[PDB]
Curated annotation (Swiss-Prot), chain A:
<comment type="function">
    <text>Downstream effector molecule involved in the transmission of signals from tyrosine kinase receptors and small GTPases to the actin cytoskeleton. Promotes formation of actin filaments. Part of the WAVE complex that regulates lamellipodia formation. The WAVE complex regulates actin filament reorganization via its interaction with the Arp2/3 complex. As component of the WAVE1 complex, required for BDNF-NTRK2 endocytic trafficking and signaling from early endosomes. Also involved in the regulation of mitochondrial dynamics.</text>
</comment>
<comment type="similarity">
    <text>Belongs to the SCAR/WAVE family.</text>
</comment>
<protein>
    <recommendedName>
        <fullName>Actin-binding protein WASF1</fullName>
    </recommendedName>
</protein>
<comment type="subunit">
    <text>Component of the WAVE1 complex composed of ABI2, CYFIP1 or CYFIP2, BRK1, NCKAP1 and WASF1/WAVE1. Within the complex, a heterodimer containing NCKAP1 and CYFIP1 interacts with a heterotrimer formed by WAVE1, ABI2 and BRK1. CYFIP2 binds to activated RAC1 which causes the complex to dissociate, releasing activated WASF1. The complex can also be activated by NCK1. Binds actin and the Arp2/3 complex. Interacts with BAIAP2. Interacts with SHANK3; the interaction mediates the association of SHANK3 with the WAVE1 complex. Interacts with ABI1 (via N-terminus).</text>
</comment>
Amino acid sequence: FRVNSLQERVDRLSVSVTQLDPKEEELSLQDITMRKAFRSSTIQDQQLFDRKTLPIPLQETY
Amino acid sequence: KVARREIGILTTNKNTSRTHKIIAPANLERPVRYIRKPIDYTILDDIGHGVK
């Protein structure tokens, strides 16, 4: 699923980049003033041994 | 390209060239031989209103 979702995401970005025009691209200071800075994902996995993570086989033995 | 386009506005050609320390003429001066000739008081007769 993820692969397919990403592939189509990659494909249309490969097209968007094609349309990029350095000659017309204008820069504004409102990005530094009115628009938040890019933030990469900061997900950290924890509590890996909750009962809900217990595999079915062991659950039955339990 | 966007960055270079932004700084390109603040630039202009720096007219610099490269040549040799010494450039001799195409044709060097010809050594003229000395020949004796008498004083001639008529060589200015055609300059201005001359008198023959």
